[PDB]
Every structure is written in C-alpha cells, then in structure tokens.
Write a protein that binds this ligand. Sequence first.
Ligand SMILES: *CC(=O)N(CCC(N)=O)NC(=O)[C@H](CC(C)C)NC(=O)OCc1ccccc1
Ligand SMILES: *CC(=O)N(CCC(N)=O)NC(=O)[C@H](CC(C)C)NC(=O)OCc1ccccc1
Lengths: 306, 306
Amino acid sequence: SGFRKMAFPSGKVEGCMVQVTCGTTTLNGLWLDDVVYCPRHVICTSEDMLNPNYEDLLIRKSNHNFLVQAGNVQLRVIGHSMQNCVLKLKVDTANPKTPKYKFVRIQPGQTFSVLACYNGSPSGVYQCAMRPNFTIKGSFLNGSCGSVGFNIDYDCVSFCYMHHMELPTGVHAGTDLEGNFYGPFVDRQTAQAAGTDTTITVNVLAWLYAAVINGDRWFLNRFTTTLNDFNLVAMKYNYEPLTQDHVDILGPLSAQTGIAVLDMCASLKELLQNGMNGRTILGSALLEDEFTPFDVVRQCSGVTFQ
Amino acid sequence: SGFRKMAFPSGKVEGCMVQVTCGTTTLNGLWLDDVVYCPRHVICTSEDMLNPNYEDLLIRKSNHNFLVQAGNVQLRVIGHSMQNCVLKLKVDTANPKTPKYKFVRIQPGQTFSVLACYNGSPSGVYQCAMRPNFTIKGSFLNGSCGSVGFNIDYDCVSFCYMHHMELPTGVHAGTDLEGNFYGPFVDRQTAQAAGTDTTITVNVLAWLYAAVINGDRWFLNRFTTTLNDFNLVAMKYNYEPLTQDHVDILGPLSAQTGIAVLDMCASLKELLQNGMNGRTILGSALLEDEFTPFDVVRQCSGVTFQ
Ligand SMILES: *CC(=O)N(CCC(N)=O)NC(=O)[C@H](CC(C)C)NC(=O)OCc1ccccc1
Ligand SMILES: *CC(=O)N(CCC(N)=O)NC(=O)[C@H](CC(C)C)NC(=O)OCc1ccccc1
C-alpha cells in the first residue's frame, strides 16, 4: 500500500553518463556502444548562443576539439556527426556498461524518469511527464543539459528525452534521442513561450483509481455520466478530452476496483465543480495528472525490472 | 529551476540487492562484502508469524536452509547470525559491486531514498522522510521486505532503513541496518498502531525557502514573529516545535534569499491561519514537510555524487 512518485532505478543509465567539453562549454553526454550523444549546443560559445548556425560551427571543428571523458579515463573522439539537435561523437572504445537499449519518442501524458547530471555525474532521479504542451516540469540547473529521461522495460532502457533548455516560466524543453525537439522549441536562447497547458484527464482518473485501491473513497458517488457530458465539464476546466481509447486503457483499473470508468468520471466531475473541501487524496490536495494507468498498475502490483 | 522529490541515483544500491529464501518465505537482502543482510522474519512460516520466537526458530536452522541468490548465481551461506531484527548471512564470496558504505541511524524529519525491491530485483526508487512517529509513508507491496533506504555522500552510501512491515493505516515500519526498529513496532503481525503524527516544521520552512529561490513569493508578508509566538501557533496546528537549532540550520537558506527565519515563520503562521485560497506553492496545494534544508540546497545548487 501507499503511493508515490516512483522513478525507475537508475543504475543502468548512470553507467552511460559522461562529460563532453568543447571550448569552455561543458555538458553531459550519453555513451552507448561507441557513440556519445549530447546536445549540439556544446559547440557554441556564450556569444554564439543567440542565433547560431550549427552546421557552420560544426564544420569548423575537429575530433580533437571534443574532450569527452568517462570518470577519469577520457575517450578519444574518432568521428562526429550532427543529427538534428544532437551531436553523435564516435569514440574509440565501446561502453562496457552499455545496457540493452532503444530510443523512443513519447506522447504528451506519458511519464518517464530523469537522471539529472552535472559534469557527467548523476545528481538525482525523479519522475515526470511530457506535458500536453510538450514541456516537462523538471528540476534542472546550469549544466544539466545532456541529462536524459527514460523508462525501463525488463532489461531494456527506452531513452525518450534529452534535456536542452529551461523556458522563462521555469519549465523545460528537450528532445528525443534522435534530436527532434518535443514541441516548437529550438536550441537557441531566444523568446520562446511554453504555450497553454491542459490537465491530462486519463492520468487523473488513473490516480483516482490508485486512491480507491489504497482505501480513499470519500470522493465516490452514486451518480454516473455520459462520455459526452463529462467532456463538457472537462473542457470547461481545461482538462483534455477523454476518448474511448482512454476509457479502454482504464479497463483493468475499472475491473480491479469494480467502479465503472464513467462512474469515476462522475466523481471527477463532482470534484471539479466542488473542489475538495479540505480533504486530500493520496496525500495530495490537488488532482494529480502525472500518473499514467501503467504507472498505477506497476505501483499496485509490484512489477520489477532486471 | 524547478523542484521535485529527487532521489539519490540508485545504482550503487542496485548492485547489492539479492534474494533470500527460507522455506516458502522469500524477501530481499543486502549483500555487502561477504555478508547478506535481510529481515529475520524470513525464517518464519506463515503460521509462525503471530508470536514467533526468533532465536528458537534460528537455532533450528542450518546454513543450507538459506537460498540466497544474486541474479542467477546463488551464494553459498557459510555462517549465520541474528543482530536484533536483522539476519546476517555470511556468504563464501565478497560482493564485487560493494560500494563504500556505512550504517547510520537517522532522526525523524530526515529524508532518504528507498529502492523498493521484489525477489532481489529493483522495482523503483523514491524519496521520503522519517515521520515524527517513526513511520514512513512508503509504497510497499508483498515481498518488499528487505528493501533499504539510503543517502549518498559523494562516493559513500549511508544505509539507514530496512523495510519490515506495513501498519494498518498503510504506513510502513522498519529498522536500521543493525536491526533495531524505528519506533515502538515489532517484527510480528499483531495489533500495532502508528501513533499521532506531527508535521515537520523545519522542513516546511525549508520548502518555503525553495519556493522563494524558485520565484514563488506570494505567501511572504511584512509581518514578523518571535520564536515563542510562532511555536504557540504551530502547536495548535499539530506542527512540531521550532528550536534554535532549526533556526540555525536554516541560516544559509535565510541568507541566500534575504529573508530572516522568523520572517518566514510569520509567513508560515499566516498560511496556517488562512490556508492558501486555492493558491499553490511549488506545484502543491499543501504545506510540504518531506524536504529538509539539505535537500533544498542540494536541489538548488546541483550537488552531485560519484
Ligand atoms: C546547457 C544547460 O545546462 N541547460 C539547462 C539550463 C537549465 N536551467 O535547464 N541549457 C542551457 O543552458 C541553454 C543553453 C542554450 C540552449 C544554448 N539555455 C537556456 O535554457 O536558456 C535559459 C536558461 C539557461 C540557464 C539557466 C536557466 C535558464
Ligand atoms: C517483508 C514484507 O513483505 N513485508 C512488507 C509488507 C508491506 N506491504 O509492507 N512485511 C510483511 O509481510 C510483514 C511480515 C511480518 C513482519 C513477519 N507483515 C506485515 O507488514 O503486516 C501487515 C501486512 C502484510 C502484508 C501486506 C500488507 C500488510
């Protein structure tokens, strides 16, 4: 019992983290097989980072301009290439600690684990989600660029995120591991706004299901609602619409608890219109939307990874 | 910027987790050097678990009754011993991945990271606190017993918690790595109650400082307060008293933000009396008390560990 923002265990990723240095710019990189992936703005100077031309800065570079270093043992660069916003640095030695891995692009509403790193060394691990506006609400200081986000599937690390920048509201933007940004953001220091964010409805229902599996029931009601009449309330409250696919993913949670998905929508509806009245749900005074149905099942059935 | 429940990277502890089996009881253990640490109730049978006589049960056991396995290789047990509620299984092989470590007893209010494990395999990592009533609000299913909590200091792991049991309210109890429970709980399945919990005042103030460092200022005011008049209010709201050692530890955070500790106390005082009016602080509609001053500094200056 209990429920927490649980991250995947981070050991497999820790063994991949390295430090990439170009000029006076130092960020974190990811070393898989004989490639180190990092953000391309490592080749920028603090006076190039306004309107850089990356192809143009890169062609003026040699393999020996990249000090890549794993712990204390450094790494000889023997090739380099740009893939969108990511640099791929071929080094002369394959990472022994390389896990079974893959690169994937996730959608808004999915969650993943972040290993925040500084100078190639892990600092901490936390969970979060791809917001519907393709920001993530992370915790990132200067030099965290190059930190990755990931999910674990038994033995297989699925890298989905690399960190590039903070936005002015204080949220974060980045790319997948093929270098394409999530959202309309670019790797320069200019005026970019996050865009309007919405609450991930399917996740809020799943966390209401986690509440019931853990004994919280004060928010249930006899009430039901149609899918259409619920979406009417949800749009009023800036919640993303609920589709039949969402209803279907919540099946297992509906059947484990005996509470029909549309009944739980009637509960969510009544919580939006009334608030909470000082009650909490799973130690929160807010409706949480950064738990997927998968997260809930995992943290309510004991799914491990090795 | 940003602020989240950040856990220590868990790789050093993952390399230590193993499966211990006695009879049909399987739980997790900690293999450090040639010793495997687990909860002693592994030697119980599901009919022993009401009023066990642990030493009586342990003298009826041989080394070969203990199936200890690290991945697929098993470890031969070549000695056994009881240290309070922890069983010490001496194995014929020293763990190669044994990090620098130590065993520490933590105080209420301090935090640590939990690596929830099942059958020796890490499932997830999360941050929490020793409540003032010596419970922890974990996320723990059947078979999570033997999971450890820890802090990291540069290279050294500090083991402070081994998981033993869930209480009826759904919170969790356990021991340090020398086997002594935190709190008045015993490793048997009888009527045990958590006791009344208080809020960790010093941590709430540290999280208020985290909010200021991250741009949340709305709850500040011109008011100030004496230490005594603040305590008069916090005790009314079931908050733990504020001492000068608390004031002292919040020194750096005070100085870095420019806000005296007693000014921030006055701000907390008003938050207790008025609530939040739907406002939020660091994404939370509650006053958060599972962040110590050290946690805030770490996350707000990017301390790393290697
Ligand atoms: C490289 C790095 O660590 N970044 C992460 C910064 C934070 N706080 O998340 N990214 C940048 O420093 C980035 C460099 C550009 C893309 C060449 N710039 C950026 O994010 O702009 C705003 C900013 C920068 C640093 C700290 C706060 C905000
Ligand atoms: C080791 C283990 O699996 N336990 C953790 C169980 C949870 N959910 O924390 N501990 C026990 O099963 C424990 C065994 C006793 C101490 C010999 N019993 C216990 O915690 O009592 C209530 C309970 C048991 C299992 C699941 C929920 C609650």
